[PDB]
Structure formats: structure tokens, C-alpha cells
Amino acid sequence: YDAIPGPLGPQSASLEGKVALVTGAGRGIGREMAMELGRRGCKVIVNYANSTESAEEVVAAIKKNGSDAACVKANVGVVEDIVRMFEEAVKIFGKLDIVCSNSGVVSFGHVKDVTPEEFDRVFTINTRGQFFVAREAYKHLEIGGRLILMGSITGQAKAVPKHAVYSGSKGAIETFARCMAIDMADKKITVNVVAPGGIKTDMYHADEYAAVQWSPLRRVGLPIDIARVVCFLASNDGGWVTGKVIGIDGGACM
Amino acid sequence: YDAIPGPLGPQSASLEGKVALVTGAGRGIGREMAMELGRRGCKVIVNYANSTESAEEVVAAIKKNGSDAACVKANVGVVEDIVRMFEEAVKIFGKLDIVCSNSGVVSFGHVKDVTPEEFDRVFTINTRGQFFVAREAYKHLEIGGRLILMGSITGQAKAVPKHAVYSGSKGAIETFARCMAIDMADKKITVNVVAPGGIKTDMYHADEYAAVQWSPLRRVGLPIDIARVVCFLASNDGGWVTGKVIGIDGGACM
Amino acid sequence: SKYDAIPGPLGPQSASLEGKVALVTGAGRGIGREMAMELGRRGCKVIVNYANSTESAEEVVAAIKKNGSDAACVKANVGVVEDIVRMFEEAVKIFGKLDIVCSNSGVVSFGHVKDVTPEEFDRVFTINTRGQFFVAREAYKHLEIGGRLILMGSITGQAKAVPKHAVYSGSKGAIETFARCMAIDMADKKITVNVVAPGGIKTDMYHAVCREYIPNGENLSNEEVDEYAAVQWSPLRRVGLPIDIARVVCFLASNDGGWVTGKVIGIDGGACM
Amino acid sequence: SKYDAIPGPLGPQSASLEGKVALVTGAGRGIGREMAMELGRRGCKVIVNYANSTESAEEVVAAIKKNGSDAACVKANVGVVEDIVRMFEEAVKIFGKLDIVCSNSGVVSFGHVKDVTPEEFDRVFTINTRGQFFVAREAYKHLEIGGRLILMGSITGQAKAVPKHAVYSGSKGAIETFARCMAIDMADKKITVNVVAPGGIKTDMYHAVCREYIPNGENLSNEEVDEYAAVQWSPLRRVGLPIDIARVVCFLASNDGGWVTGKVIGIDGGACM
Ligand SMILES: NC(=O)C1=CN([C@@H]2O[C@H](COP(=O)(O)OP(=O)(O)OC[C@H]3O[C@@H](n4cnc5c(N)ncnc54)[C@H](OP(=O)(O)O)[C@@H]3O)[C@@H](O)[C@H]2O)C=CC1
Ligand SMILES: NC(=O)C1=CN([C@@H]2O[C@H](COP(=O)(O)OP(=O)(O)OC[C@H]3O[C@@H](n4cnc5c(N)ncnc54)[C@H](OP(=O)(O)O)[C@@H]3O)[C@@H](O)[C@H]2O)C=CC1
Ligand SMILES: NC(=O)C1=CN([C@@H]2O[C@H](COP(=O)(O)OP(=O)(O)OC[C@H]3O[C@@H](n4cnc5c(N)ncnc54)[C@H](OP(=O)(O)O)[C@@H]3O)[C@@H](O)[C@H]2O)C=CC1
Ligand SMILES: NC(=O)C1=CN([C@@H]2O[C@H](COP(=O)(O)OP(=O)(O)OC[C@H]3O[C@@H](n4cnc5c(N)ncnc54)[C@H](OP(=O)(O)O)[C@@H]3O)[C@@H](O)[C@H]2O)C=CC1
Ligand SMILES: O=C1OCc2c(Cl)c(Cl)c(Cl)c(Cl)c21
Ligand SMILES: O=C1OCc2c(Cl)c(Cl)c(Cl)c(Cl)c21
């Protein structure tokens, strides 16, 4: 039990030769996770449901940076798509080392106005979808693999009105991480959740206020702020971090 | 702002003349919530989905203790039932002061073995169902009302293997409570979650180990242990408690 | 099977504090005074501890007696462990037993971390943290089997946007961990240990430092402060009062709180700080 | 728009600590020594603080130099605020600047709450809590704009089943609140403040009190202890090592940790305590 796990020094942060799959990587945070993982030496499978041109654009940009990439279409709201996606994925690069479950949708509304269709739309993607991406990831990941789920500051936020559906769909992910860390540990896979505060993306648009209001550091959160933490968790540096929820919001209070 | 909210002294704990609706009150924890609320002076609407004979038995026992009660059949997995249930409910006693969302199902399985049907079965009742019972409760509750949702120690537990689905369905409730407390506060309704540890019920069966293992107090948790906290929250004593998660597990660590 | 035994009475009596003896530290003023009054109103005999406010302490004692319950004041400085030990010995000799201990005494403190002196850090922690721990140590020793220990925390223990409050906040955050750990130890006597964590509450502490939680509120009128506390710290749109806290303390102090141990109950009207 | 500016380098360089100067308290042994070594391995110049282990401190300093990075030891007792101030002044005069401060020094303590003495409580809090706060105060003052402050917590800050550990656990729990509050204050210099909360880690502290976290483990062999720690505290089935902690500290210390502030990162292999 004294045996050092992995390399001492900077190489422990290396993602060289790893293969990562990121869901919803054609745009926003998912796109930057893919770009950054690629820059650190990973071959990346860029999943998308709709944004096809965007997806091929991410794949091309990743190749331009020196790493192989490919895209796979799949809607996480359909478990059959998720199963197919992983089967396709492992055949592209031969194995899967890292899985970043990032696909998600936003929603707003006073609880009184929430319809079952809106609730179902959000939970099927943000919660159910991530659960099943996690199930398939467990099956296909290399022993010693990595699974990073997507949460949000709203999972624990205390002052966000008209956001019960969205927040609740994200809060659930935090418990999944704790519970899946136990189950998936039998293949030495760590399972963690990244919980971004506000981050500039299309979802975000739906700067000075965000800068001064949600951060003492006085700036806006960017996709790269999240991508960097994902790479840490995905590396050997994140080896003793499992079942945790990492808040990435610049010291926000919401 | 110096005006005292409600009566000073013991009367602040009184539930005399209140009308409460409890979901899944024909058995287990829900049955005891109904009995105890009744003993404290509440008229109780006993909801059930299947246990009809059990439901009428709870209603009869509550009457025998000195309070009026009635039962209403409704499956929380069907939002149409929930809407109907509340419409029926308010017509029985004329108003609704307290709503205890308690209906829930248990589930077990290593993440790898979870099917979409099992995941959906559990989330539709434990999460989606409670959300919609909450939505209708908001609509029908008296200004100054009370909404108590049902959680679990598993929402935050760290060592329960093969329980991602169940735990996650409960963890979501904790975020709902925080978010609904904001929305529902416009009618002065407090929203909280009770999170029981192991409690002796039918679900439980699925004593010395539970006694010594999950509690320094060295005994098993009972439905009344939960019912009592529910009554506190439901009373004027719980007036400044909103958006909170109250753990009721005798000091357990799971 | 023997575990099927119902702990305590079924029904409203489970919330009764009749014939209970409680001790409240810092009960001459603020939240502590109201805890004492409310506990007295629900049937408890109360030992009203105070360190300085003698006249106020006797006023609370007289008021509690007027409401129909016995009371007595005991002077003790929580920053001196010898005083606490002496206080508990005097307490059990006044009423014979101790069923409930409410550790409430505390001081507030403001200042950017860069400006904190070892003397200021020491002053706050000696009362808020060290003091509560030894009041707890003694409460464990003297409490009845099946007793109750309620510690005083604060929303600041978990708050994320309170600047210039590291010392005070940290002194209350420590209490949350004490509750979890002491709940284990004290359970060998069936004592439950919990923390009440209030948000802003109208008391002398409130008035003094209230403006220090409000961005550019140093020039706020008292009404603009109350109004700011009402709308800003609570969806319920009102200010927190000592009675809001006293009521939860009584719940925890009663048989209703029997399965509640090692917990932190936030009492802030749904505040985000 | 100006907020679209990317903070730091894109790619692997963002994890680089090249040309950084770090100070680690209690770096002569245990987790602190490894933090120093690993920081040194990633390109940092390190000030190895120690209070007693002089020979060990110079050994760490020599080892760091052998790995190709400069280092120097500074003696200071964290329980004495004057020592900490002097330590920071000496530190910035050795390497010219300070980019990273790792507050690691700490002592362990065991005992049922009833048996805790004011001297034992004071000994632990003066080093674990008071000491870390003043190392933090000074780190704020001397750190570069955009610096890093990593405080040492523990799984015990939130643990729910550790008996006879209220003093130690409480001293670490306070650190979690300090991080949230200091992150606000220290942000005016763009400094991020976080806490690393390890589970059981093989060091001298580990060996001594390990058996005190294991029910009836007082008669366990060293192997049965390691084996118990392996299976009992981690689904990953292995014991935690100083390097497991050092790696996370380096992440936080780098540009990768730029948006991570006011957080507590648990590093326990998924333990439940
Ligand atoms: N940006 C923010 O402020 C925060 C975001 N988050 C979470 O981070 C994640 C990324 O957010 P962000 O990048 O801002 O989002 P955007 O709205 O910019 O796009 C997010 C991604 O979700 C994908 N997606 C949606 N539905 C599906 C689906 N059914 N199957 C597969 N992929 C799908 C989209 O792909 P496609 O184009 O193919 O539809 C898109 O790639 C989300 O889960 C979000 O909830 C959390 C906190 C804050
Ligand atoms: N007992 C324990 O250890 C713990 C329980 N809990 C939660 O507390 C609640 C009560 O648990 P417990 O009493 O032990 O459970 P039981 O299994 O004894 O029965 C729970 C209740 O759920 C009701 N129910 C199930 N489905 C529905 C539905 N579709 N619509 C309406 N009611 C429904 C059942 O009614 P019916 O007969 O009509 O089907 C029953 O009344 C649950 O939500 C549970 O998850 C949380 C932590 C611990
Ligand atoms: N007001 C608020 O908004 C909040 C208050 N709290 C906590 O609640 C507790 C009481 O607060 P509050 O009533 O507002 O405070 P006040 O400022 O009104 O004073 C409260 C009590 O503290 C007592 N006290 C101070 N020092 C000592 C000491 N050395 N030994 C014994 N008793 C002492 C005082 O005694 P004496 O009469 O001798 O002066 C007084 O009885 C504190 O622990 C506080 O930090 C937590 C969150 C919010
Ligand atoms: N090991 C574990 O399982 C865990 C450890 N921790 C925390 O990590 C930190 C280090 O732990 P670990 O390496 O195991 O501990 P060790 O017992 O191995 O000793 C660690 C360091 O603490 C230093 N120290 C003690 N007192 C002082 C003082 N008064 N002033 C300055 N430095 C002092 C020691 O200095 P010196 O050489 O002079 O003796 C030593 O360098 C502590 O804060 C500890 O509580 C947290 C969780 C788990
Ligand atoms: O936690 C607290 O301790 C004292 C206090 C005051 Cl006096 C006020 Cl006004 C507010 Cl808002 C808060 Cl949150 C606190
Ligand atoms: O939190 C801790 O501080 C020291 C320590 C040791 Cl020395 C051991 Cl062995 C274990 Cl298991 C834990 Cl959790 C801790």
C-alpha cells in the first residue's frame, strides 16, 4: 500500500494517449472540454445531437491542434442512442479512458407554472440522460478510467427563484456521483461532478453584473475555467478524488 | 417587523383545527404522520394508490383518536390524479393547511444493471410525483401553509452501494426544497424536506445491526420519530424554518 | 422487537417540557433571554446565566417566575473554564437536575483578514468556540440520561458572501463539527446534541453589526436596515426574531427531537448569505 | 467583451508551476514534506518550514535541490504569531516573492469530550486553527497578486462516525469556513483560497492515531491497520498516500485552479467516516 500510484512530478497531469468522449461537445462548455482535452494529448469523441456542422468544426479544430478527434451523433434522451454511441466510440479509437457527461438543457419557471412535459424534457436530458451515459461509460471504460458528470451551483444554490426543475435535475447528479463512485470503483474508475457557476455560452446568454455580482474575483466564468478542472480530474492528479462535487464558480454565492 | 408571529408559549406547537393531506398514508411512515397529525388536532386526508382497506383503517383510527379523517385515491405517477386529488381534498374539509409529500418506492442495483424502466419507475414516483404534489399543494394551500417533502439520508450518504437510482431520486428533493421555498414564500408557505435514516416499515424490511450500526443511541428508527418532526415543521414553531433539510436518523453515518 | 417500543408519549405531550430544568448561557439579553422565557413558558425551571448583565438577568428571572415557572440566575464567564464548572455545580444544586442545556453565549467580530489581531481572534474564539466546548463538556457530565444539548451556530458557518467575517464565521463553523462529533460521545447517556444556526436576528448584536452584512449600508437608517433584512435575507419578507429561534430550541429540547442528533438546523427564513 | 479574455495559457501549460515560489508549513515530514517535494518537482522554489524537525527539514531541502529546483528551510512555530510574521519576511527575502502558500502544519488529538482539558483543547486549536489563520493573514499580505493559498482540513470536518474526536475535528472544520470567508477578502488581490480535506493518509500522524478510528483496532497489527484502511475507508481498496494530496495541491496551486476558490476538496478515495 506504499506503492506510488502513477508518476511523481508533472507527468501525473498528462493526458497524453488517452481517449475521451464528451457529450454535447459541438458547442459551449462541452466544446471547450473537448478542445482542452485534445490540447493535453487526448483523442476526443465529440458527441452531438443536433449541431452537426459545429461538431465537425470541433473535430477539425482538435485535429489542427495535434490530436485525433471524431464525432458521433446521439441523443441522450434515448437510451438506445447512448448504447449505440458507446459501441461506435470504442471502435473509433479502440478504447475509452475518460467520459465527460456534459449534455444539458436549461429551464425557467415558478413551480406553479411547471408542466409535466417541461419537467420531463429537462429531467430526461439533465438527469436520466447522464445516468445512462454513466451506465454505458462504466461498461466501456478502461480499468482506472474516469467519469466526470455535469452539475451546477444551483444544485445547492439558495436564492435562485423560478428554477426548481433545472436545479433539481442538477442536484440529483451530486448524489449519483457519491453513489456511482462506490459501484464504479470495482473497475478503479473515479466518478466526480463539476458544478459550474455562470459560464459564458449560449445557455449563459439565456457581463458586468455577472462579474461584480457572482464573483469576488470580478470577472465572468468561461468554458476554459471548467475545462481545466475536468482535465485535472481526468488526470492521474485526480486519482484520490472520487465521489466529490467540485464547485467552479469563482467564489459565487447564489 | 417586531410583531411576534403567532402565540408565545406551547400553543405555538398546536396543530388544532388544521387540515393536512398526506400522500401514501395507508402504510408505513405516511400512516404514522397521519395518525400523529390527527392526535395533535388535524383533520387528515389519507391518500393511497393501492392499499384501500389500509387507508380506511387509518381514517377510522384517526377518528377514534378524536379527529376527522377521510381518504382519497390517487397515484402520484399520474399528474392528472394529483390534480384531482387536491380538488377533492379541499372540498372534503374546505381548505388545506399542511401537505406531506411522502409516497415513495425503494430500488436496488449496481449502476451497470439499471434499466430505463426501473429508473423511470422510481423517479416518476419519488421525484416527479413529489414535484407535482408540491405544485398542486402550492395552488391549494392556505397563505401561511406548510409543505413537507420526503427525502432520505441516502441523498447525502457516502457508503451505500447499489443505490444510485433511489438515492439520486431523493437527493433531488433537497434541491427542490431550497428552490420551492423561494417560489412558495409568496404565499408564506414554508417548504422543507425530512430525511429519515432507516425506519421500521415494510420498506425497511427490504434490528440489532440497525440499532448498533446506524445509531450511537443504539435503537431502531420508528415512524413516530419522523412523524414528530413533521408536526414540528407543520406547526408555528417551524415558521422560520424554510428551504431546509432535517436529517432524522439518530446520528447515523451512511 | 423490543426495538418496537415507542420512545415517549404519542400525541402533543411529546412536545411538552413540563417539569424540565434547563440552563441557558447568556440569558440576560438577546436570543438567550428569549430562549429562557419560552422554555419557561413551556414549563421549564430555568437557570439564567450571565457574565455582566446582572440587572437584566434578574429581570429575566423575575419575568419567568411571573409566567408561572421557577428560575434563578448564575454568574459565569464562559471564557473561564473554572466558572463553567462552578456554574453547573451551582445549577444542579438550585433545581436538583439538568435536562436541557442551551449554549448561547457569543460575541460578534468584523474585519478584513489582513487586519485581524491575535488578541481579537483569541477574544472571539475563547467565547464562541472554546467556551461552548467546555459548557458542552460540563453539560455532558451533569445532564440527565436522555438530556439535551443545543449549541449556537450561525448562517455564517456556511455563508459564502460575507466579507470581513472570517474570525466570527469560523468560530461558529467549528460548532457544526462539534455537534456531529459530540453527538457520538454524548449518546452513551442518550443525550442529543444539535446546533441551531440563525440568520440575522433582531437583538443588540443585530443592531451593532447588521450594517456590516449590507453592502454600503453603513449609512442606512434603522428602518432601511430592517427593510433590507426583510427583503434581502428572506423570501418570507420579514426580519428574524429571537422567538423564531426559541421555538426551534424548544422542539429540539422536547421528546419530538429524540431522533434528531448531530444536526445543524438553519433558522433564517430561507436566507442566502 | 473584455471579459472574453482567456485567463492564462490554453493547453497543458496551464498546469505548470514553473518559476513559482511556494511556502509549505510543516514541510520537514508527512504530507507537508511531499507537498514540498512535488511542488519542487513541478518547477517551484520551496521554503520548507519546520518547528522542530531541523535535520528532516534540511533533508527535504537537499532532496528538492537534487530534483533540480531551489529550496530553503525557515524555522517557525505556527503557535507563535511573531514567528509566522518573521517567517514570511525571511521567505520573501530568500526568493524575492511568494506565489503559493500551503498551510499544512497540524497536530492530532483523541479523547471523549468529557475528558478534554482546556490545555489539550488550547494546544490543538492554537496550531490547527489559530495557527492556520495567521499563516493565512500573512500569506495574504505577502502573496503575489494572483497568488494561491491552500489550507489543510480533514474528512473529520464533516465526518459523522468518528468518536472521541471533537477537538481535532472541530479545529479542521473551522478551516472550511475560513476558506469560504477568506476567499472573499483575499480576492481583492486575485488570490484563491481553498481547503484540501484528506482522509487517512500514511504518515507519522497516521500510524499513531490510525487505530483510534478503527473500532476495537487497538490490538491491530500494522498490516491489519493498512488492510482495514484499504477496504474500510475506500471503494478503491488502497491506502491514501501523501502524494495523493500533493497532486491536488499542485492543481489548485496552478492556473488550472483559477476559477476554484472558497472550496473544500475532499481527498479520501471516496471514504465514508
Ligand atoms: N453555461 C452555464 O452557465 C452552465 C452550464 N451548466 C451545464 O453544463 C453543460 C453545458 O452547458 P452549456 O455549454 O452552457 O450549454 P449550451 O446551451 O451552450 O449547449 C449545451 C450542450 O448540450 C447539448 N445537448 C442538448 N441536448 C442534448 C441531447 N439530447 N443529446 C446530446 N447532447 C445534447 C447541446 O448539443 P446540441 O447542439 O447537439 O443540441 C450542447 O452541445 C450543461 O449540462 C449545462 O446545464 C451548468 C452550470 C452552468
Ligand atoms: N422506511 C425507511 O427506511 C425510509 C423511507 N423513506 C421514504 O419515506 C417514505 C415512506 O416510506 P415507508 O413508509 O418506509 O414505505 P412503504 O414501502 O411502507 O410504503 C410507502 C408508501 O408509499 C406509497 N405509494 C407508493 N406508490 C405510490 C403512488 N404511486 N401513489 C401514491 N402513493 C404511493 C404506498 O402506498 P400504497 O400502498 O397505496 O402503494 C405507501 O403508502 C417513502 O417515500 C420512502 O422512500 C426515506 C428514508 C427511509
Ligand atoms: N443576533 C443575530 O443575528 C445572531 C446571533 N447568533 C449567536 O446567538 C448568540 C446570542 O446572540 P445575541 O443574543 O444576538 O447576542 P447579544 O449581543 O445580544 O448578547 C448575547 C449574550 O452573550 C453573552 N455573553 C457574552 N460574553 C459572554 C461571556 N464571556 N460569558 C458568558 N456570556 C457571555 C451576553 O452576556 P452579558 O449579559 O453578560 O453581556 C449576552 O447574554 C451568540 O452566540 C451569537 O453569536 C448567531 C446568528 C445570528
Ligand atoms: N495523516 C492523515 O491521515 C491526515 C493529516 N491531516 C492534516 O495534514 C497536516 C499534516 O499531517 P501529517 O503530515 O500527517 O502530520 P505529521 O504528524 O506527520 O506532522 C506534520 C507536520 O506538522 C508540523 N508541526 C507541528 N506543530 C507545528 C508547529 N507548532 N509549528 C509549525 N509546524 C508544526 C510538524 O513539524 P515538526 O517537524 O517540527 O514536527 C510536521 O512538519 C496536519 O494539519 C494534519 O492534521 C488531515 C487529514 C488526515
Ligand atoms: O450570523 C450572524 O451572527 C450575528 C449576526 C447579525 Cl448581528 C446579523 Cl445582523 C446577521 Cl444578518 C447575521 Cl447573519 C449574524
Ligand atoms: O482526519 C484525520 O487527521 C489525521 C488522521 C489520521 Cl492519522 C487517520 Cl489514520 C485518519 Cl483515518 C484520519 Cl481520517 C485522519
mmCIF file of N, CA and C and ligand atoms in Angstrom, chain D residues 154-156 168 199-200 205-206 209-210 213 233 273, ligand 6:
data_model
loop_
_atom_site.group_PDB
_atom_site.id
_atom_site.type_symbol
_atom_site.label_atom_id
_atom_site.label_comp_id
_atom_site.label_asym_id
_atom_site.label_seq_id
_atom_site.Cartn_x
_atom_site.Cartn_y
_atom_site.Cartn_z
ATOM 1 N N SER D 154 -9.659 18.360 6.829
ATOM 2 C CA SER D 154 -9.715 16.936 7.076
ATOM 3 C C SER D 154 -11.118 16.409 6.821
ATOM 4 N N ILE D 155 -11.211 15.116 6.553
ATOM 5 C CA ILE D 155 -12.502 14.468 6.352
ATOM 6 C C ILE D 155 -13.316 14.606 7.647
ATOM 7 N N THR D 156 -12.626 14.725 8.784
ATOM 8 C CA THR D 156 -13.281 14.850 10.089
ATOM 9 C C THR D 156 -14.134 16.094 10.228
ATOM 10 N N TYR D 168 -10.066 17.792 17.648
ATOM 11 C CA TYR D 168 -9.367 17.750 16.369
ATOM 12 C C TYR D 168 -10.297 18.054 15.196
ATOM 13 N N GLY D 199 -8.416 12.177 3.804
ATOM 14 C CA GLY D 199 -8.977 11.138 4.631
ATOM 15 C C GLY D 199 -7.712 10.637 5.315
ATOM 16 N N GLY D 200 -7.671 9.362 5.680
ATOM 17 C CA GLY D 200 -6.493 8.825 6.332
ATOM 18 C C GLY D 200 -5.358 8.746 5.345
ATOM 19 N N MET D 205 1.485 10.801 11.731
ATOM 20 C CA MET D 205 0.202 11.079 12.378
ATOM 21 C C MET D 205 -0.698 9.861 12.197
ATOM 22 N N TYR D 206 -0.678 9.315 10.983
ATOM 23 C CA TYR D 206 -1.460 8.139 10.622
ATOM 24 C C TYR D 206 -1.199 6.973 11.551
ATOM 25 N N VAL D 209 -2.389 7.598 15.523
ATOM 26 C CA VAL D 209 -3.822 7.582 15.787
ATOM 27 C C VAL D 209 -4.716 6.765 14.880
ATOM 28 N N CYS D 210 -4.130 6.108 13.885
ATOM 29 C CA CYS D 210 -4.897 5.297 12.944
ATOM 30 C C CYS D 210 -5.843 4.376 13.693
ATOM 31 N N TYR D 213 -9.442 5.295 14.934
ATOM 32 C CA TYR D 213 -10.568 5.499 14.018
ATOM 33 C C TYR D 213 -11.167 4.118 13.694
ATOM 34 N N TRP D 233 -12.019 2.285 4.389
ATOM 35 C CA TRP D 233 -12.189 3.692 4.027
ATOM 36 C C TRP D 233 -12.155 4.052 2.550
ATOM 37 N N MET D 273 -16.823 8.454 6.639
ATOM 38 C CA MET D 273 -16.443 8.446 8.045
ATOM 39 C C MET D 273 -17.307 9.322 8.940
HETATM 40 O O1 LIG E 6 -8.668 13.358 9.562
HETATM 41 C C1 LIG E 6 -7.548 12.827 10.013
HETATM 42 O O2 LIG E 6 -6.412 13.554 10.615
HETATM 43 C C2 LIG E 6 -5.477 12.643 10.922
HETATM 44 C C3 LIG E 6 -5.960 11.276 10.535
HETATM 45 C C4 LIG E 6 -5.347 10.050 10.642
HETATM 46 CL CL1 LIG E 6 -3.750 9.976 11.319
HETATM 47 C C5 LIG E 6 -6.042 8.899 10.193
HETATM 48 CL CL2 LIG E 6 -5.277 7.327 10.318
HETATM 49 C C6 LIG E 6 -7.333 9.029 9.656
HETATM 50 CL CL3 LIG E 6 -8.257 7.648 9.101
HETATM 51 C C7 LIG E 6 -7.915 10.275 9.551
HETATM 52 CL CL4 LIG E 6 -9.493 10.470 8.880
HETATM 53 C C8 LIG E 6 -7.213 11.380 9.987
#
